[PDB]
Design a protein around this ligand. Sequence first.
Ligand code: K
Ligand code: K
Ligand code: NI
Ligand code: NI
Ligand code: NI
Length: 603
Amino acid sequence: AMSSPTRALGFLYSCYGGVSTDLPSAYLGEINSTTDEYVLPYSWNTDGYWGAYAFNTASSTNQDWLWGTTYQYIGQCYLFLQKLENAGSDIASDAEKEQWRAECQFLVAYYHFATLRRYGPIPITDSYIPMDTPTSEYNGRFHFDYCVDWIANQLDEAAKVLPANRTATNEWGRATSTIAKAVKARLLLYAASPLWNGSFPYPNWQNENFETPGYGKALVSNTYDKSKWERALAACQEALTLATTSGDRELYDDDEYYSRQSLNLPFVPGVADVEDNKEFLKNVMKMRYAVSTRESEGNKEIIWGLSNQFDFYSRYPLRILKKSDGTWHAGYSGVSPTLYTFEHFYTANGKLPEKDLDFTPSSEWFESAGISSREDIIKLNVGREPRFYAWMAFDGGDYGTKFAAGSPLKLEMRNSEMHGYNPSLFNRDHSVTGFLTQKFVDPVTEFYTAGGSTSGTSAPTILFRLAELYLNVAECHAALGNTQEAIDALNPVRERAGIPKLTLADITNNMTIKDWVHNERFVELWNEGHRFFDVRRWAEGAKYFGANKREGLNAEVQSPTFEEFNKRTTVDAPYVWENRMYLNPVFYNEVYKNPQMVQAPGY
Ligand SMILES: [K+]
Ligand SMILES: [K+]
Ligand code: NI
Ligand code: NI
Ligand code: NI
């Protein structure tokens, strides 16, 4: 696709340039910092787009135009393909051309999907568009179900050609059949969901002067279609089977990496480092490593990951460690897990705290657990599942392993001169809720008194991993009424996390199979850029993202007593949900420039 093999390869490489769009876990990104998982300080709303999307002040002139990027790279793909058709065998063999075409095909499909999941019905662009094209020829949005069918067919075509697995040798992760099928699986699952399968809030939203074959001017189905779940199940089953066979993927299950890295097991309240507790404590560290390790470190769970990194300082506590020069290593402490998060991670028995007969009643959750020398730890934070201690952090508990000059950092969230609220000292920065997260934080992370620090070796940012494929299959079985099979899909994820398996006995009028799947997803994929899309596709924006839903402790008052601090407090920022927020508004200019384009409803 130009004047030499090296040139053409470089051109192909540039086609992958858009895959970091809506990067998971980047704290300024709206798909990350606008959900009920966690909140950022309201004063941080001047930075990035998260504020606009969280508080419903996004508009056609105040938006994240990722559409611009995705169609930019789609064009780059078809431009490549066009040049490659005129390319001789001195550029690439026929077999290699086929590979390159499949890579571009996958990319075009993925880029469309990345646009679809944010904007809804989109124009299908399946060729290079010369800029002297008459505006009357521009495609408008195609009906959502038309879009789904095309993307799915494009992913299936690419999967026929692409290899199922590749060796990780550098930072360029090229497409596989495994990735193609996993994208399709997530696509069809989304398509079968309430928002796109019977619960779209604007049933009369439609095209004005553009037709979709099979649908006329309609844009979204307004009627439940069970066949969508049937096709989603088959797609999810296929993706899982492929990944676990020639994809050579398996859930990360190493219990001893911490040991090979010369680390101590973590402090967990009520679970002392003794022989009878080793399994639990080792599960805690396993779950820390599960989302912070390379394939070369032994992780074979990641299906698609990127070299692109995201910031950690935003989740670190305020004062980390006093250097020998008297100044402090410091974090921003802004990523602030909600009570919703602290109430929906499981108990040690694999149940919701509220539902668990063997767990503290909600009336006592904010009382001290009375743990000697760690009296700040409340009862809610004792007796939980390994994933909770792996990924969360709280007053009186530890942050990290080697964090503060080789030792774990004890959190003092009520201390205005350590990790607590104090605008005069820390300016904008503080935990909004009194909690923190340490997900993705490398256990080897260490700040040095002499200055400097290490965050250990870097890890890919996950786009797709295998645990998701289990959860997807589980969700399809649940929708179809296949209760045992839904349970069978959830259980490998539960067992790996060190909580009990579900049986039919666990499925009741107090905890349905759909409850279990959705909560397993909330936990396992926490802060991996899913909750944004999942709450939307489930059409539960009002329920989880609405005004006053977000809660935490009394963490925005200076130097509170234990009793003042530990009180359920509504997060004090103008969060709202309105139905227009299901969709990303189209850039003002695009709506103006394309006569066949319609704006999202309410924008
Ligand atoms: K790989
Ligand atoms: K407890
Ligand atoms: Ni309806
Ligand atoms: Ni209870
Ligand atoms: Ni228009």
